[PDB]
């Protein structure tokens, strides 16, 4: 019994370790989000099929590695979905022939937030999966440890909703002026969703964000956002009503706002974060 990956990394007879690099395409669902599907990534075969049958299980101790080390979910294994991390062994899978066969494993994540996410840098570990192989021939009992690494930079949602772009860049026209922001949110089922803004306000009224230009900063003007033509203060919650699978626009627009005093010429830039909550 030996295994190998799609890119050729192999583990010989007796066990060992390997690295699996996969492209992540997470998708949010009603009950639990998807992290990675590991079908067609890992292939295992049996060397003496005519007399030995190998029994393969997902051994206890499998869990999420890397930044995801604190999240729990379920795992699809050979017909059902068991709690993850695995505190107990899973049922058997029989490997029967020399021709390589997949080791289909899929990992899901139980939502814990409203619209949260975690940023996965490329080449970063996500999960560790221990494969245990015994047989019906002798005392062989071996461990194959697979380290799953993200081949690309993605954001894994930790909530029930999702957003169109995790980083949105918009450019203002020259002062005075405004421009809409293309940001939309959706959820897997009808949820009473709302959001609020967080940033370094520069006014007593808490409606103007500080200009943090790195080079040649203009003075006397910040950034102010309007929802449907109305000024939104920073930490005042904004209600969106029921949101379903159809994408619902936030309707945000950025404007120029004077912080008082004379206004000079230069660059303007502000950083604004949007946080969603249940209502």
């Amino acid at each position: 019994f030996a295994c190998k990956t799609a890119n050729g990394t192999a583990i010989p007879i007796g066990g060992g370790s390997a690295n699996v690099y996969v492209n992540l395409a997470p998708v949010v669902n009603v009950g639990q989000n998807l992290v990675v599907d590991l079908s067609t990534q890992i292939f295992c075969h049996n060397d003496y099929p005519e007399t030995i049958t190998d029994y393969v299980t997902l051994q206890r101790g499998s869990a999420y590695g890397g930044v995801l080390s604190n999240f729990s979910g379920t795992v699809k294994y050979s017909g059902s979905s068991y709690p993850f991390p695995t505190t107990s062994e899973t049922p058997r899978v029989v490997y029967n022939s020399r021709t390589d066969k997949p080791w289909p494993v899929a990992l899901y994540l139980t939502p814990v937030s409203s619209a949260g996410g975690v940023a996965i840098k490329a080449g970063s570990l996500i999960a560790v999966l221990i494969l245990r192989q015994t047989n019906n021939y002798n005392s062989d009992d071996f461990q194959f440890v697979w380290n799953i690494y993200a081949n690309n930079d993605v954001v894994v949602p930790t909530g029930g909703c999702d957003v169109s772009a995790r980083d949105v860049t918009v450019t203002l026209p020259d002062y005075p002026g405004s421009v809409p922001i293309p940001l939309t949110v959706y959820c897997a089922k009808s949820q009473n969703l709302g959001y609020y803004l967080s940033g370094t306000t520069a006014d007593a009224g808490n409606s103007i964000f500080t200009n943090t230009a790195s080079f040649s900063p203009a003075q006397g003007v910040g950034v102010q956002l309007t929802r449907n033509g109305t000024i939104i203060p920073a930490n005042n919650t904004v209600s969106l009503g029921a949101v379903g699978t159809s994408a619902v626009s936030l309707g945000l627009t950025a404007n120029y706002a004077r912080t008082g005093g004379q206004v000079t010429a230069g660059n303007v830039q502000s950083i604004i974060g949007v946080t969603f909550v249940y209502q």
Partner: antibody
Amino acid sequence: QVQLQQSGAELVRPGSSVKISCKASGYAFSSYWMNWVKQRPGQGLEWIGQIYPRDGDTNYNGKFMDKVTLTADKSSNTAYMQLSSLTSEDSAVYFCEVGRGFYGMDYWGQGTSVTVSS
Amino acid sequence: ELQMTQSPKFMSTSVGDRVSVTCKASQNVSNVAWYQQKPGQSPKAMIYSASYRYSGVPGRFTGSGSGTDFTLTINNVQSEDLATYFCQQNSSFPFTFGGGTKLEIKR
């Protein structure tokens, strides 16, 4: 050292059922197949069947399948054999044998003499 | 099933010379093992896979053959080789033993 210790000789009358045992030691009892072989007096050897103790998997001779019933007890390292509807032909010595999973070594029991007569 | 055939039933030899015991099967096999038994004792294994000695077996025991027409031979009898020898196939269920050849002294 690997040794196999069989039960004592049994004398039984026809129509009864006798249950002989072969207790093992010196190795992982659950993980290896155990063979059972029959030798009639003044004759050759004959293969009866085999059991994998860990899962209870069994293989039988077609000639012996109905009569023989094989079982194992993981707690006490004992492998049990049962013969039913005993006739005159069931009088022989029964051995237990281990060794498939071992490299170049083989072990046998001392044999249990079973004589059936009224 | 595979009926392993042994003939002759009795084999006569002196001390120090070379004996040859033949075993021929009805179908082609891969593994053939040779067993020895002395009266009142449980059988002992000598050769597995037709050419390989077990642990502790003297070098006088060698085995030839492949597919069919197997052979166990002894080169220099030592008066402890007087016993009965069987051939067994485990290749296909059920495992079948040979008839057995008894090896004795010529006088």
